Design a protein around this ligand. Structure first.
Ligand code: MN
Length: 387
């Protein structure tokens, strides 16, 4: 009863000591950068509340060597300006307008918000995703220029863990910081995502699931990821990732089971996004008694794999927070039929033969190292590099 845990340790999960050490380094580099950002823009300093570290690495759900995560930079509009969040005509997306920005500007603390409308708002004082992204990109560029550069446009930052190199580029809506040890070893990429955070009173009700932790996780935020829709720039995504992280925590077999299924997905059906698997497990959490997660890893894996296949076969994975959004509604029936048939064959092949699981989860090259006793995760990303 250790086959699945052994596969996970040797071929799936970064050792937790290295997870923790890389997080301490990365979080310190980013605090230095965000503190410098505050020196470059009083409006950013006024808006800034906190950061949220987003992605599978920080959820404990990353398969293999971690490569990137999102720095969700949470900005807060003063409630005196009367922000109003409305559920949009596209399930899962919202609009945000301000009903009293002028009254806030007439307050003493509103002085630093003199350019907020110009920088962030479209017609009728709607928060605009494109304007927000352009504002953050400009601020990041301004900040990068004030840092010491070595080599060719490589920033050098120091902290209690040593000296680090920051490279940057824009491959999407948000700037990416590539963070490396000064000795050359790459650590991780970080996307700098400008978000707006709200208190529990603003939680959407029209077609949305209620907050499971309104006392201890009261806040949620909106993310400038658009769904063609009109009006352009008004549609914001909701992030309930802070609540999702609590839902998946303290559940023993759950995170190994998710990663085993994600490993299977990477090998046999990359057509399915990782968040769709995460979403299936949110539904399973809601359906199952809490004791389910204390069963054997084999039983949790086999049972959730079967239920995952039923979602795929049904061709519907409802967005956990707004059920009218089918996360796989855009995938073709033929594709989903083939993937469900694939998974059904795998279930039959491993049903009564747990020694066949590794044959389906691992590439042939990984399987050879598996049989030979190798551990490819032990040194996948040492927080203290060998140099
Ligand atoms: Mn339940």
């Amino acid at each position: 009863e250790n086959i699945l845990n052994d596969i996970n340790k040797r071929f799936i999960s970064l050792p937790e000591e290295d997870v923790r050490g890389n997080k301490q380094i990365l979080e310190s580099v980013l605090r230095t950068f965000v503190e410098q950002m505050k020196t470059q823009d009083p409006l950013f300093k006024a808006l800034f509340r906190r950061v949220f570290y987003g992605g599978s690495f920080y959820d404990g759900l990353k398969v293999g060597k971690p490569e990137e995560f999102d720095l969700d930079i949470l900005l807060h509009i003063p409630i005196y300006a009367q922000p109003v969040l409305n559920e949009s005509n596209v399930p899962g997306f919202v609009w945000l307008k301000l009903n009293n920005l002028d009254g806030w500007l007439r307050q003493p603390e509103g002085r630093v918000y003199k350019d907020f409308r110009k920088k962030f708002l479209a017609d009728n004082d709607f928060l605009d995703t494109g304007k927000t992204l352009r504002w953050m990109e400009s601020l990041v560029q301004k900040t990068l220029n004030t840092l010491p550069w070595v080599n060719n446009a490589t920033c050098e930052l120091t902290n209690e863990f040593g000296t680090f190199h920051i490279n940057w580029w824009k491959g999407g809506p948000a700037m990416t910081l590539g963070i490396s040890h000064s000795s050359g070893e790459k650590i991780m990429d970080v996307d700098l995502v400008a978000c707006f955070v709200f208190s529990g009173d603003k939680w959407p009700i029209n077609g949305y699931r209620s907050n499971p932790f309104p006392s201890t996780k009261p806040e949620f935020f909106i993310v400038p990821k658009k769904p063609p829709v009109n009006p352009q720039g008004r549609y914001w995504s909701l992030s309930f990732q802070e609540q999702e992280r609590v839902l998946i925590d303290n559940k023993n077999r759950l995170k190994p089971a998710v990663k085993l299924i994600k490993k299977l997905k990477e090998k046999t059906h990359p057509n399915i996004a990782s968040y769709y698997i995460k979403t299936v497990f949110l539904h399973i959490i809601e359906q199952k008694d809490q004791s389910f997660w204390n069963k054997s890893l084999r039983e949790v894996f086999m049972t959730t794999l079967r239920e995952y296949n039923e979602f795929i076969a049904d061709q519907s994975i409802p967005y956990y927070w707004c059920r009218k959004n089918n996360l796989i509604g855009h995938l073709a029936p033929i594709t989903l039929n083939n993937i469900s048939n694939r998974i059904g064959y795998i279930i039959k092949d491993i049903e009564n033969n747990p020694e066949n699981i590794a044959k389906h989860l691992l590439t042939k090259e990984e399987y050879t190292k598996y049989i030979q006793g190798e551990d490819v995760m032990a040194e996948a990303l040492p927080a203290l590099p060998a140099s």
